[PDB]
Subunit: 311 residues, 5 copies
């Protein structure tokens, strides 16, 4: 089999569509997601044209091997898609309608800057390489782009699935290449982060501040050091759910900042004890009373500054 | 091969059945389960009809390639099922009886609201896409729906395996699609959660309340902070067995609430010490004595409220 | 290709044998094990009869596709076995000798009641479904059932590999099925559980009992709470190696009981401090002295009772 | 099919090119990386030559089975590459232009000496074995070596992708083998290690040094022992992201050294308490005051020495 | 195709060789390793002999399907090897030279008795089953046994790769079987265990011994209990990198013994406090002073005894 010949000099237009059936396994660390979808293809092949009056048949069904089919690939996949051809239909004018159901693991970078209050645009890049006989170009049939109502991505809200209609046509290894960008817009369900990570982390921090209403050095050391260790556990827990980024994430910033608060609280607890031992408790009392206001106030202002810089 | 032609304009009815052989790997985090079953198919193909007398047989056995077979798929699968055809039998009137043994990983959302005292309805959606030649509709042969007595799903009780007899017929990319819903009802074996998570979590909380029979600030700080950290360990342990949900689970609610009890116990321990230092122990004694009753009472009432809201 | 025809009316007997080459990956949580074995099959197919004089050869060698082969399956497998035909030898009367080497992941439930001092009976169920032309039945050739001397299952002792000679013949979806039960008896190597989990857990418990020779409340709180937390770590460690069971395991029972001992030790430590503060140390001394005997005695008796209930 | 015959006695030159499409999964522990790329091949096959005039075609397309294709393999792969032939074009003189898209898991050793401030040279070794008919040699077509601009390796910066033009020709199993070295130069994005591991580890160490401004043995024991345990947690965390090396890594060196600082701080805390109890606090005071300067100074100098030895 | 016929009554000798290209994934817990190698086979097939002067060709290259090839398998593999035939060469006398490149996951038991100072002998067992026509026996061509210089097994030193030249010929299921033992000798790179596990474990133990220079019960309880818990963390860490063994490993023995030292240190700390409270500090002082010498001395002697028993 060979490509359909051009009537003039025009490139062959392959109309495409992706209909999402299943979305699963959005892996943050790997920056991948798995997809199960319909891929639809359409192009004119005049060699396949027939008479509907004499044939009595409106459509002809072909097996993939019987006809020429464009070699469509995904750019951002781990391995080549697992595909099963569903149908091939030819209209009397020779317009071919191809439909396959496929499954693939897609590589798509994620921006963790606003984590866990982040939104993402996942991409599925469709591609075709031109043949020596003729140039192949891709197009979007919007009537064949969509998603099943039941499509759910655990821990995410699916906003939209659209295609950028204009392909990116470019040369690669001395041939033309035609690339389409299918975009799946998602927003993270931040809910669970509140009772599981955020609030527990704030509770232990506030517990360390009870040391500002205590003169007992021994108890103070226990309060600040114990809660700091619990903070380390939360830091480790958070970093296991995320890849290593060349930038600060919102959660990372807060987690990092909280260490500074524990560090300064240890200095205060130390200074307080030192003055008490040096028979200067009135001074120690002034520092401790100031700390009761300073710590929550600086914590609130630093958080307002951070939220402002990140959102 | 082509579909059986319609005598009038009728859709082709494909009778289905699923007989479960094995159920395994119900993954809560992934919201998947693995299945090994028999899939049975039946439809009328007049072109296959024969005379028993002339042929000298009452049944005819074909190879899948020799005859037309409907392209039946599962909607909610990760990848296409691994299937092996067992038998194809034709009756004199062209009634085809198809049997395959398959294995598949099924995506089925889970409701964790009542975890670990939850029940689920797992779905296996069977689907067929109509052809240009004819419309294909699915039906349930109840005599061919069932499960082996030995079918066990580790950590779950299997209640029933039934099919919703009326298919959900709908248009998808200008073709009729016929969808059947096979339902596997299961209930979680909550037993082990009691000695492993629930009771240990209650024991550490009750241990934190012994601080209401102690005047020692240093010992109190140790009792409350240590038990809080152990509570954080249980919270982390629980959240590892579950996906992130945009709602509160029953266990999640209790775990979250217990933090508030630890937070208020730290306030009480702090207030008690502060008053003792300020030479007002009679007051501190009133707060501590009230706490001995208030803490267990509020804990019991809050749990009754939560159980009521969740069950 | 169709089944061999009956001389009279008898069912076709397929003689079977399983020879184990490798046993690996007994996964307690999944209740699976991997197997690499020889599957031997033997049946008479008179349509394959030949004259050694004419054909030259005394035994014919065939390719699986060239002849009829019974569709033998495993019941309790995750996916269909990976098999490679080693030989298909046909003798002059038409007796076929089939040999394949296969690998499979077998689902076989485990009884954890006596863990880690438990024994198991793993099953490999061989099955054949009857056809319309004729009924197929399975038999065991004991001369072809066995295991390699080097077969080792990490963490287990292999006792025996035998087959229940009588097949279970039954109706399934309006056709006969013939099922054979191959049994692999194993016993767990409990050795490592003693220095790794059992003894460390007993040491920390005995360490908490040193609080019965101390009047220091602060030190007592540290002894009992610290060792309790280490006990929680061991409980978590143990539960990670096991699935969730709707029953108590032997280890689970001991682990659970030890929590009660920690809970009562905290009560004793609290009661002792309370009386000391109330200027009644003589009483506190009576309770502490009784505790020195009561705790180890009740621990020993409770363990005798548990061992009796479980073994 | 057989190799192209030599016009004289020359070896057959197979021109190669690798164009990287995707780079993912650089696993430090496994010392592997996954690659998705174009592999281009070019060689002259006289037997396939044609006259453009009598053919009416300027180029001829073939199926891989129709013509002789060199058996090109990768040396450093886990399993053989998953490849899909994209195009095979033949020019009039019989110059073949082969293009495949492949995916492979590459084994490439990593030098962790400067971790996490390390750079690596990943290798992809292309190989061909000679035949009895003729010697097959590999060459690099520099015009066909490259990478997509969007190629991103999570946690790394990609510097260059070049090929060593001269192949390594040698005998292997009595046939000559022609090996090409494709080099991917990368540098680790160390950013995240600073707020996640480095700074938290320094904060806890500095917190242990507050014991040099405290006379309280009980509080000192708590400060030093608690922070040491948190240091053990960071040591464990770091070692989980790395394979076991027969050398010291930069991070490993610092982590190890910090243990010595904790060990000496415990000695100081012990010596201080001992002298205090022995009624010699003036002495203890001299040791403690010296420690306040000595600990940070020796820490800074040891770090300058280490950075010097490693960079 | 059928086997080559015997000239007299001799078994067919299949000469073998394994040349290691890659060694990776030595999994201690699973007792497996992955291998990528060349497998060479050689045997005489007279039915394939040809005239060198008449034919003009010195060697004939065949496709695997065109000729008879012995069915060679590996005994100790998880699944059948992934193999790709590289070349088949026939010399005039009919000597066949077969070469394939394969990848396999090999099951090979490991002796952990001396861990982490252990050495292992990994096995790759090659096997052939005889046919009815004739007996097939295996031999080693030492000229075709070896390994690439770049072969590295992360965390191990590769010593030698040799074959036991004499096959183990035995009857299995009424046919002869010929088995060859290929041995890969390796020694563990123990280096990293020293700064990561051994030294940190010794540091915490020595820190517990500072309690012998302290009269503070409260501080002593904190020193011994805290360090014991850190020892439990190291015990857990070590046991995660190892399978469960029916014997004691060297590291396991030391780890277990260290618990006894912590247990006796708690007794000493308890006895010391008890005597102090009973107004007998002179005695307590004798026990504490003896402990300062006894603990390190008994620790050193017990380690010399253990090293002697294990090495
Ligand atoms: C500890 C520090 C407190 C954490 C503060 C929440 C973060 C925040 O301020 O989050 C803000 C995001 C919404 O952001 P958005 O629509 O993505 O941004 C786009 C914004 N533009 C277009 C202006 C740039 O989420 C929320 O609804 C916050 C609700 C959670 C409250 C948690 C309480 C504890
Ligand atoms: C403190 C928190 C303790 C948790 C208490 C158990 C939760 C509960 O009350 O669970 C309730 C469920 C039963 O629920 P059901 O039939 O599935 O729900 C459907 C109910 N409708 C139809 C009314 C809506 O389980 C039990 O039988 C409780 C046994 C566990 C006891 C463990 C206590 C320690
Ligand atoms: C504190 C509790 C410590 C637990 C003690 C082991 C439980 C036990 O005594 O287990 C018993 C099993 C033997 O059981 P069996 O022959 O498989 O059972 C079938 C028994 N019938 C036929 C009588 C019903 O193990 C042993 O050989 C005991 C050695 C382990 C001692 C470790 C001590 C530390
Ligand atoms: C504990 C002490 C803190 C650790 C010191 C930083 C490591 C270092 O010194 O890092 C050095 C590397 C740069 O090295 P380079 O260019 O790869 O080496 C090639 C060098 N030659 C050619 C001279 C041999 O990273 C940096 O940019 C340092 C930024 C990290 C700041 C961390 C502060 C906390
Ligand atoms: C706690 C005490 C620390 C343990 C000490 C090492 C154990 C040992 O003594 O290890 C010995 C092995 C060497 O063994 P080999 O020659 O393979 O044995 C074959 C022995 N035959 C042939 C005599 C039977 O390791 C070494 O190279 C020693 C370096 C490790 C130092 C660890 C520092 C702490
Ligand atoms: Cl693709
Ligand atoms: Cl499917
Ligand atoms: Cl099977
Ligand atoms: Cl390859
Ligand atoms: Cl093999
Ligand atoms: Na085609
Ligand atoms: Na068909
Ligand atoms: Na067959
Ligand atoms: Na070829
Ligand atoms: Na062959
Ligand atoms: Na303390
Ligand atoms: Rb104290």
């Amino acid at each position: 089999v060979s490509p359909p010949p051009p009537i003039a000099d025009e490139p062959l237009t392959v109309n495409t569509g992706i209909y999402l059936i299943e979305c699963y396994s959005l892996d943050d660390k790997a920056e991948t997601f798995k997809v199960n979808a319909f891929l639809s293809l359409s192009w004119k092949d005049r060699r396949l044209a027939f008479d509907p009056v004499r044939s009595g048949v409106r459509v002809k069904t072909y097996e993939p091997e019987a006809i020429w089919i464009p070699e469509i690939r995904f750019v951002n996949v781990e391995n080549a898609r697992d595909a099963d051809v569903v149908d091939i239909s030819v209209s009397p004018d020779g317009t071919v309608q191809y439909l396959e159901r496929f499954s693939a693991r897609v590589l798509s970078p994620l921006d963790f800057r606003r984590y866990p209050f982040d939104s993402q645009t996942l991409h599925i890049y469709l591609i075709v390489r031109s043949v020596d006989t003729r140039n192949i170009v891709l197009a979007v049939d919007l009537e064949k782009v969509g998603k099943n109502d039941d499509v759910f991505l655990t821990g995410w809200d699916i906003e939209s699935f659209t295609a950028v209609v204009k392909p990116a046509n470019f040369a690669l290894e001395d041939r033309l290449e035609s690339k389409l960008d299918y975009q799946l817009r998602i927003s993270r369900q931040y809910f669970s982060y509140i009772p599981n990570i955020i609030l527990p982390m704030l509770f232990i921090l506030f517990i360390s501040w009870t040391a500002f209403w205590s003169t007992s050095y021994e108890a103070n050391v226990t309060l600040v050091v114990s809660t700091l260790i619990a903070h380390i556990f939360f830091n480790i827990l958070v970093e296991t759910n995320l890849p290593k980024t060349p930038y600060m994430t919102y959660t990372g910033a807060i987690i990092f900042m909280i260490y500074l608060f524990y560090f300064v609280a240890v200095i205060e607890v130390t200074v307080q004890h030192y003055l008490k031992v040096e028979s200067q408790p009135a001074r120690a009392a002034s520092i401790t009373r100031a700390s009761r206001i300073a710590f929550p106030v600086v914590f609130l202002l630093a958080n307002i500054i951070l939220a402002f810089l990140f959102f």
